[PDB]
């Protein structure tokens, strides 16, 4: 046992670099974004970006550069993976088939050597002669790119300058000429060399060297018309041409460091400078035409253009449009100005591309209708600081929406018989019916002749003999298409009101009290052909023709009022073909027959929102397999639409749902909406293949998502968001924020820019006196200048997430953990404080503070000073377990409401992460792998059970069950530990064996249980067992799942065959990509399966599909083995996608 499944819900949203050029065409301007393992290719249109292809790579994209070799009609792509996979890639379109082809590829890693602290640097010769990389300190790697070299074989040059800050190839020199800032005991200097592929060594650049501004980080290669290099730092920008030196130190840089640059003008006239505060500067190179000896640089000037979101990189596109590649907040697309408007802004956000990263913490919550589940709330972080609310479902894209309250039903209509499409939408209210004529996208209240609007319509629609029908409460009206005229009218003989209706193309079944009349639609003729009475009142009706029925249904489905039954009647005669008892008391509210994948069903929904459904036999009217689902407390109204050729059912209630079948069992995709009362398909000229959806206040025309999707809401804080948790009782979230303030001339503090805790009506500051400060202000991080943390707790509501109450912590307390709890009284918010002084590396002064919130009043209840830094806390069997530093404390809460020191565990170095299950306690000790503790009652203390050997620098930790433990470490790997018991007094039961390895490629803060999909009892399938969701620093949020022993093998096998097919996007072997990697270790990876390989099964040709299934012995649950077909696996993978 111990088999695991990793599948990407979401996908990294952070930009790790973006490059511009002519990849797709040549006439095209392309933008290429790297997400992590994802490559997104775009074309720049007059108005924005047009997405052509997104590719996934078996690697973390480290270098992504476009280059044009001589004799190539377009730019090629060069990619380097962080696992050192290099490749040249080419865009190819086979008429309609998009293909990225691997021109050259290889693993360029040395067979030894430690990566530089500054990371991989890749640069391409301005003449595409060669590729130069800095992988390790004191070596320069050169790939001879020139001429045919297809395995990307590469040599190394010794680089006496050990500590390289930044390299770039210079423009316009008689040899490949490399320029770099380095660091030695003397400071930082710029030096240059020449690279000769010929002799394989440096030779010496166009100038010996220069001293460089103390903190010089960037090296910009300036193009032909100038040809120098720009060197950026803090407080200074310099130009070096080689003999020519010119520098400036504009005051408006001293606020934050310059992270990124980008050339605006092909000649190199202007450059864009992204900040760290999230500023945007224009760099201007002063052209001075001299007289003969022609263009010379006069000066440098910089001008603030305004504020973007915090940029990891940027590229200007054209027409003053810029793409902002952000990793800390939402990436964006912006317009620049010639003349700045109000508040001196040349910058305006055009499009905001949402990004979840980093995600410091997250929790799972059941908010919408409480029926499982399903939403995740996460994080942030800086001024980009935000709360993201993410939930799973089928989204609707609104194209029109009218404030039109109290709709009581909707019907599409073709007024024009010559027209294919709908042109009229009819709605009914309590009072009456209104008619909406659809012109363009324009709706229009008219009337059609023959339709009354005195009272409510129960049904209307196109009908048999080129006619319209309107079944009102009062009557049944039959209108003629050509000359719109009432052509026949049926009323209940004794002038009574219709109480229930139903209608297909040629048959009608109305109901009065108990009575039922079956009418038929003929030219000009509403011919009544049958009249019965029912045992009790008629609740609802359906006469939908099923399958080979000539629009003429042999059956009639009906729900009854007091006996609460859903019975099938033989239509012609009303011969009761099958009665079915449902439940007690609650009156059935909607009934419908329908065909799913050529199998026939009878669905039936009640006034409490409970839906039954049966397998209806068309012949015998036989119902079988009574299955029952609850879906929201509103009486669920049923309806139909057509998804492809396939036909689904919309379940209109407070918790709207769309039902369809996949194999022969039916699936409930949750619709991403507030209430929906009624609904109908509208295929208008102006609204093609759309839906009319009415809630209590609003008509809506729109388009429905093809498949269940995954969907996000932003709540901006302008603060770093840190930790979060949900206090379900006080209908409230609690968030630990923290804001940068600048140390003042006097006492420090003072924020820049208002944030969630500054805009805070009802806010507090505990001035708890338990600490004693130094007599002389020990101001470090500048004794009067630079920044300070400042950390408070905040309260977000629930729905609406207005910020209720803000509370400033100890003033120097960093505060690292958050909790919603009980031990006897009320539900408290407990905060584990840090107490960081600039200034000392080790923290040695905790504080656990207990809070009680209500009515915007947030009250410091209890308190306990600790002698360390409370790294995490957990509600544990009624007690509050806490890691302090090396120590793991238990803490108890007695009357007098104080937190009182129970038993301890001492043997740890860091102890940053805690996770309990029952009486078991998982401990991520940062400085030495992970350990299992038990609280033993009958006993009252801690007992080490098992330690993992091999020392993992874990990112976060998680329990999967009392035997398996999940870790993610700084290596972007995952590991799984194991319990046991071993014979004869000696315990390897004390050894937490580690039994699963997997290179994720992401960095995991927070795991947590819960899911985004609703889970089904008896049916569905159990290749899924657990559900643990996890947050990435790139905003990718995968889930892990417990697999069957049987299942694991099948999928393990699948992978290998899938691997034989699937053109890898740089001939990177998948098994390698996944195989567990450290700077010291590399191992195959076991116990895990990536759904991302499994799911990419649904994306290949049916031949290649059959190739993978060839020779496969498959168990379909029958136990009797059979040859597997391509379809057996499609409905297996199909299922597995429906688990996130």
């Amino acid at each position: 046992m111990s088999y695991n499944y990793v599948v990407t819900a979401q996908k990294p949203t952070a930009v790790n670099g973006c490059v511009t050029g002519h990849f797709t065409s040549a006439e095209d301007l392309n933008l290429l974004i790297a997400k992590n393992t994802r490559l997104e290719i775009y074309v720049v249109t007059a108005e924005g970006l047009r997405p052509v292809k997104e590719v996934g790579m078996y690697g973390k994209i480290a270098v992504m550069e476009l280059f044009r070799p001589k004799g190539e009609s377009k730019d090629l792509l060069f990619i380097l993976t962080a696992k050192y996979n290099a490749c040249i890639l080419e865009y190819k379109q086979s008429g309609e088939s998009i293909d990225i082809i691997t021109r050259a590829h290889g693993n360029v890693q040395d067979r030894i050597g430690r990566p530089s602290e500054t990371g991989i640097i890749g640069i391409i010769d301005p003449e595409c002669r060669m590729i130069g990389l800095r992988l390790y300190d004191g070596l320069f790697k050169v790939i001879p790119l020139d001429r045919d070299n297809k395995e990307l074989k590469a040599f190394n040059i010794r680089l006496e300058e050990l500590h390289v800050i930044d390299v770039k190839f210079l423009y316009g020199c008689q040899a490949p000429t490399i320029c770099f800032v380095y660091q030695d005991p003397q400071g930082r200097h710029v030096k240059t060399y020449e690279v000769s592929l010929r002799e394989k060594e440096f030779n010496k650049g166009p100038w010996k060297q220069e001293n460089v501004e103390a903190e010089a980080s960037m090296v910009i290669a300036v193009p032909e018309p100038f040809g120098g290099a720009i060197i950026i730092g803090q407080e200074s920008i310099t130009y070096h041409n080689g003999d020519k030196y010119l520098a400036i130190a504009p005051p408006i840089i001293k606020q934050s460091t310059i992270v990124c640059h980008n050339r605006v003008d092909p000649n190199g006239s202007r450059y864009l400078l992204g900040d760290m505060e999230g500023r945007l500067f224009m760099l201007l190179l002063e052209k001075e035409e001299q007289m003969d000896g022609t263009v010379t640089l006069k000066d440098l000037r910089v001008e603030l253009l305004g504020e973007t979101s915090i940029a990891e990189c940027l590229t200007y596109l054209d027409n003053g449009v810029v793409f902002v590649g952000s990793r800390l907040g939402d990436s964006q697309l912006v317009k620049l100005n010639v003349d700045s408007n109000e508040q001196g802004s040349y910058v305006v956000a055009m499009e905001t591309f949402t990004n979840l990263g980093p995600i410091v913490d997250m929790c799972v919550v059941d908010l919408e209708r409480q029926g499982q589940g399903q939403l995740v709330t996460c994080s942030g972080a800086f001024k980009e600081g935000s709360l993201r609310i993410i939930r799973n479902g089928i989204g609707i894209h609104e194209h029109a929406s009218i404030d039109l309250p109290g709709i009581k039903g909707l019907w599409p209509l073709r007024s024009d018989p010559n027209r294919e499409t709908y042109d009229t939408l009819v709605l009914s209210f309590v009072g009456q019916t209104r008619v909406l004529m659809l012109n363009g996208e324009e709706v229009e209240e008219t009337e059609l002749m023959g339709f009354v609007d005195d009272q409510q319509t129960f049904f209307c629609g196109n009908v048999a003999h080129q006619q319209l029908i309107q079944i009102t409460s009062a009557s049944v009206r039959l209108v003629s298409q050509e000359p719109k005229a009432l052509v026949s009218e049926w009323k209940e003989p004794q002038a009574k009101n219709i109480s229930v209706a139903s209608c297909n193309s040629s048959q009608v079944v109305v109901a009065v009290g108990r009575a039922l009349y079956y009418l038929q639609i003929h030219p000009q003729e509403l011919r009544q052909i049958s009249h019965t009475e029912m045992e009790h009142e008629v609740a609802c009706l359906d006469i939908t023709p099923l399958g080979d029925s000539n629009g003429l249904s042999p059956l009639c489905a009906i729900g009854l009022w007091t006996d609460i039954s859903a019975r099938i009647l033989k239509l012609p005669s009303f011969e009761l073909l099958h009665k079915e008892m449902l439940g007690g008391e609650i009156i059935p509210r909607s009934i419908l027959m329908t065909t799913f994948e050529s199998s026939h069903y009878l669905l039936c929904a009640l006034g409490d929102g409970a839906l039954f459904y049966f397998g209806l036999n068309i012949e015998t009217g036989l119902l079988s397999d009574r299955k029952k689902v609850t879906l929201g407390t509103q009486p669920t109204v049923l309806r139909t639409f057509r998804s492809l050729s396939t036909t689904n059912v919309f379940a209109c209630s407070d918790r709207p749902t769309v039902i369809y079948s996949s194999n022969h069992k039916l699936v409930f995709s949750n619709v991403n909406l507030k209430e929906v009362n009624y609904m109908c398909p509208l295929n208008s000229d102006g609204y093609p293949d759309s839906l009319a959806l009415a809630n209590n206040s609003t008509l809506t025309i729109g388009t429905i998502d093809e498949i269940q999707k995954l969907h996000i809401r932003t709540v901006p804080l302008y603060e770093s968001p840190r930790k979060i948790c949900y206090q379900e009782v006080s209908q409230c979230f609690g968030v630990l924020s923290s804001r940068i303030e600048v140390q003042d001339t006097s006492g420090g503090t003072t924020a820049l820019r208002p944030s969630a805790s500054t805009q805070a009506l009802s806010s507090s500051v505990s001035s708890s006196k338990l600490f004693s400060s130094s007599t002389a202000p020990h101001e470090t991080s500048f004794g009067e200048e630079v920044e300070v943390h400042n950390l408070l707790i905040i309260d977000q509501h629930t729905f609406e997430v207005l910020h209720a109450h803000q509370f400033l912590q100890n003033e120097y307390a960093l505060s690292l953990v958050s909790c919603k709890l009980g031990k006897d009284p009320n539900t408290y918010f407990i905060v584990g404080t840090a107490m960081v002084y600039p200034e000392e590396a080790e923290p040695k002064q905790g504080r656990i503070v207990v809070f009680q919130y209500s009515d915007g009043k947030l009250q410091t209840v209890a308190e306990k000073e600790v002698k360390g830094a409370v790294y995490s806390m957990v509600e544990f069997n009624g007690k509050l377990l806490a890691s302090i530093n090396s120590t793991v404390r238990l803490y108890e809460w007695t009357t007098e409401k104080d937190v009182r020191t129970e038993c301890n565990h001492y043997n740890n170095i860091m102890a940053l992460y805690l996770k309990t299950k029952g009486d078991f306690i998982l401990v991520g000790d940062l400085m030495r792998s992970v350990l299992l503790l038990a609280y033993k009652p009958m006993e009252g203390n801690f007992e080490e059970i098992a330690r993992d050997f091999n020392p993992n620098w874990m990112s976060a930790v998680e329990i999967l069950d009392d035997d398996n433990f999940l870790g993610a470490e700084n290596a972007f790997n995952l590991f799984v530990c194991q319990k046991d018991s071993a014979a004869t007094t000696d315990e390897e039961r004390q050894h937490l064996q580690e039994v699963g390895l997997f290179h994720l490629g992401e960095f995991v803060n927070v795991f947590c249980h819960g899911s985004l999909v609703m889970q089904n009892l008896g049916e569905t399938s159990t290749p899924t067992q657990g559900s643990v969701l996890f947050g990435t620093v790139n905003g990718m949020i995968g889930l892990v799942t417990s697999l069957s022993e049987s299942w694991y093998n099948l999928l393990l096998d699948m992978q290998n065959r899938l691997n034989k097919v699937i053109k890898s996007v740089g001939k990177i072997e998948h098994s390698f990509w996944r195989s567990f990697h450290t700077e010291r270790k590399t191992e195959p990876a076991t116990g895990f399966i990536d759904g991302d390989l499994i799911e990419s099964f649904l994306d290949i040709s049916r031949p290649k599909m059959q190739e993978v299934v060839a020779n496969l012995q498959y168990d379909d649950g029958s136990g009797m083995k059979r040859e597997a077909t391509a379809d057996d696996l499609i409905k297996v993978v199909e299922e597995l996608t429906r688990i996130h």
Binding site: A14, D110, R111, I112, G113, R114, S116, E117, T118, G119, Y136, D137, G138, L139, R158, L162, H163, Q183, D184, P185, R327, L328, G357, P358, V360, T780, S781, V786, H789, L814, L816, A834, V836, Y837, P838, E839, E840, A841, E842, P843, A869, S886, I909, M910, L926, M927, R928, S929, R947, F949, N950, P951, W953, N970, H991, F1003, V1033, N1034, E1079, R1080
Partner: protein, 368 residues
């Protein structure tokens, strides 16, 4: 000298919390966080000051091996021929093998990576045994054939399934773990003090000798008669040359007062030189510098010398811990009433416990 002018650690004044959160946000290079942890460790190492468990056996300590997995199990070799398999934190009377006592010094011992109930040994009896701790041989991997020729120094690589032994004359034998000879060429002119094959590159062997050189070899490529890849010259005889975990960088410890780091991007010339007294004495096991298995640090026994140019005014029989990029004293470990010259010092697999062969004694340094 400096492996890039300091791996300077993260955010203003670098409080670990500040550094850890930075790492969390994506804003912090792992190598930076690393350094922060390293500092955090270096601090705990000052309270390591406690020897929590001491022991002897007899004669003198000559070989130290940490059990590859258990962070409590330690093997110790003796000039006599003694082997102690000691799991401290168990109080269970260490498994013991008594040796010859006459010759029979254990000049080297590594645990059998493929089976930790067994160990390998470089014996002054002239044999490299593969032997069970329950004192019984399985196969003598090499025996001398002339008296006065014995072996001094082992390694052994689970991964490539190799065994290398250096004899006291300069010969190096290379064996596969079945016992078949692939080597024998006299790689060095005098006693081969230390043999160590690269943790990250199966076939990349470093051999250090009394001939005042360290040699670097390729086994799969250059079997062809005593014609290595690099030979590093030293001021004196070399006591030990062992690789950093990860295989880049080699830690050379000479016989008098010089320790060297050699980078993988070079090998040929030294990255830095750390001056540090360790001298030769009569009944003293040669001092050897070692890496900390996890952080970038160096451990050594200091052996005060009135002639060595001391930088510090206070020169005791301390356990020295050097940076390893800076090359500069990160702290000293010293227990009056227990300290003497600490020949050997190795950290755990986990690097949270320090085993010290203190000439005659075995010391276990741990945090309170």
């Amino acid at each position: 000298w400096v492996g890039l002018a300091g791996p300077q650690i993260l955010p203003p004044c670098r409080s670990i919390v500040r550094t850890l959160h930075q790492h969390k946000l994506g804003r912090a290079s792992w190598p930076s966080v690393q350094q922060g942890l390293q500092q955090s460790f270096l601090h705990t190492l000052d309270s390591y000051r406690i020897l929590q468990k001491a022991a002897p056996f007899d004669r003198r300590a000559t070989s130290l091996a940490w059990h590859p997995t258990h962070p409590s199990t330690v093997a110790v070799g003796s000039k006599g021929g003694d082997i102690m398999l000691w799991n401290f934190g168990i109080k269970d009377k260490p498994t013991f093998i008594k040796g010859i006592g006459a010759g029979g010094s254990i000049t080297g011992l590594k645990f059998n990576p493929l089976n930790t109930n067994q160990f390998y040994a470089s014996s002054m009896e002239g044999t490299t045994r593969l032997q069970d701790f329950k004192g019984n041989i399985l196969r003598v991997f090499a025996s001398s054939d002339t008296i006065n020729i014995w072996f001094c120094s082992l390694d052994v690589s689970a991964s490539s399934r190799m065994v290398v032994t250096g004899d006291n004359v300069g010969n190096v034998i290379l064996l596969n773990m079945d016992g078949k000879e692939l080597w024998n060429l006299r790689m060095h002119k005098k006693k081969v003090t230390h043999v160590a094959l690269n943790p990250c590159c199966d076939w990349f062997l470093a051999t250090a000798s009394v001939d005042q050189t360290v040699k670097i070899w390729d086994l799969r490529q250059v079997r062809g008669k005593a014609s290595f890849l690099y030979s590093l010259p030293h001021r004196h005889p070399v006591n030990a040359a062992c690789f950093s975990p990860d295989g880049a960088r080699l830690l050379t410890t000479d016989q008098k007062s010089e320790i060297r780091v050699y980078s993988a991007s070079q090998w040929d010339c030294p990255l830095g030189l750390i001056p540090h007294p360790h001298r030769h004495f009569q009944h003293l096991t040669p001092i050897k510098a070692a890496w900390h298995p996890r952080y970038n640090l160096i451990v050594v026994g200091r052996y005060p010398d009135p002639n060595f140019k001391s930088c510090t005014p206070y020169e005791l029989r301390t356990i020295d811990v050097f940076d390893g990029n800076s090359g500069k004293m990160m702290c000293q470990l010293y227990d009056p009433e227990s300290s003497g010259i600490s020949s050997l010092n190795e950290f755990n697999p986990m690097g949270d416990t320090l085993a010290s062969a203190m000439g005659y004694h075995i010391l276990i340094w741990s945090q309170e």
